[PDB]
Structures are given as C-alpha cells and as structure tokens.
Amino acid sequence: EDPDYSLVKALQMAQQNFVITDASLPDNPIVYASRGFLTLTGYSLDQILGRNCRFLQGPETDPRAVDKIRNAITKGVDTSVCLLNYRQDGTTFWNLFFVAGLRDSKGNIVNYVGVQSKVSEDYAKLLVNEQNIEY
Amino acid sequence: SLVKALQMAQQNFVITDASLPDNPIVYASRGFLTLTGYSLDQILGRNCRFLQGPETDPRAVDKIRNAITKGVDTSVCLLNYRQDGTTFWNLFFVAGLRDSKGNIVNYVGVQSKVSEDYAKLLVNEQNI
C-alpha cells in the first residue's frame, strides 16, 4: 500500500549527507547538496554547484576504487565504495559512498543521487579488504 | 505488485527545505518541470500547493498536511493542475529526510501521473 523508491530509500539511509547530479548536463554536475554534505566536506554550496563530485578526491585516493565508481556509473548499476576523500581544508576521511541512477519512463538515467558517510578506521579496513576480493 | 508494480516512475521529484518557514521548494527534477509545465525559477522558494485547484479534494490535502507535520511517509492520489490549467491525477509520495539525530530538514516528493481507473481505485481506498 506504499511504494518502494530507490531514491527515497537512498535518501533515508543518507543522514542528511547527499547530493543530486544532473546526468543530462555535461559531466554529471551537482545540482543540489544537503547541508549535511556541506558540513561534512567543508565546502559552501555555490562552489559545489555545477561541479563533478571528483573534487572530493586527492593524491592518496585509490584509483582502483575510483575505477569501480566510474565503471558502475557507465554501466548504470548502483554500487557503494569506500575510499579516502578530502575536505576543502585538506583533511581526509574514509567515505563509504553509495550512488544510484534515476531513470525516466523510457529507461534513461536522468539523475544520480550520491550518499556520503564518514566511517571509522576499523570499519574502513574491513570494507576495503572486501572490495579487494575482486582482485 | 498492485500499488508499486506500475508506480515505477522516479524522474518526477522535488526537494523542499523544511527549515524554511513555508517548506519551500529548493530543487525540482526536469521530469517534474515537464509534468507540471513550470520553469525552475518560478517553482523555487514556493510551496508545492500551487499544483492544487478548485476540484482538488481538500480532505486529501489534509492527509498530506498531517503526514508532513507528523513526519510519516504517505502516498496520496490527488487531482493536480499544470501551469496551463490542464489537470492530471497525481499518485504522490512524501517522505521526511532525517539527519543522524532524527530531525527532518528536507522532504522528498515523488509525483506519478496515473490513469483514470487506477486513480478511482486509489481514491475509493483513501476514503477509509
């Protein structure tokens, strides 16, 4: 009597840390960001707008994990990855990050919802060792 | 697979800021813009109640209002209006987006253009 919603389910596991991108626009730019995301990353909203989320990555980020995210996106499947991200001030944190494509009635991915979440060193070690099972 | 097997659309949605007085629109998908016939700027900063008109069931509007204050997720079938005056039945869903403390700071709203007979079914059921 009440629908399942990939978008709603995602945004509710997101504890006010999320973004929305527009896939129809060049390079999948951010078009909304929650206050939780602003305070987690350290960026202000205007700077965040119209930019691809890759700005959260830095020198130490695992390119292999970025590979998984790029690949998941091109293929239209939802996944989650744990990688090192960077705040506006240069401080780092491990990010268990989930992404889901939103499609129109004709099956075309039109928007993306990203969900970020800081995790402990311990949880991250666990998460990364699982992700590395692929290799 | 009765109320969700064919309510499958997710391109029509809006996000409102509940921390601002009249729970105004802060974002709206292009699918929404196309459905309702509005441009994004006009939509922004306004409450969504502009979709309602003379023939919209007040009792259904109530079931929404109450679900929002109480912060519970609900689906409501409504008669809505496009900017050009034309109507459509909206199987509409609201959910509160809470932070790590359980506070609602945002709301997602997903709208679904539905058929005549499906809406009659949804409406007959709502009357209980």
Ligand SMILES: Cc1cc2nc3c(=O)[nH]c(=O)nc-3n(C[C@H](O)[C@H](O)[C@H](O)COP(=O)(O)O)c2cc1C
């Ligand atoms: C909605 C959405 C949210 C994203 N959030 C993050 C994120 O929080 N951290 C991150 O490192 N990458 C994130 N990404 C991935 C980057 O935006 C980008 O797709 C990725 O770095 C691979 O693309 P590239 O090789 O062009 O950099 C997100 C992508 C999308 C679509």
Ligand SMILES: Cc1cc2nc3c(=O)[nH]c(=O)nc-3n(C[C@H](O)[C@H](O)[C@H](O)COP(=O)(O)O)c2cc1C
């Ligand atoms: C995120 C969100 C989306 C909404 N979308 C619609 C909609 O598409 N159609 C509609 O009739 N009401 C919609 N509403 C309901 C109105 O915005 C408002 O909550 C409702 O009219 C009850 O409040 P009121 O008694 O002041 O009118 C939405 C509300 C929220 C919070």
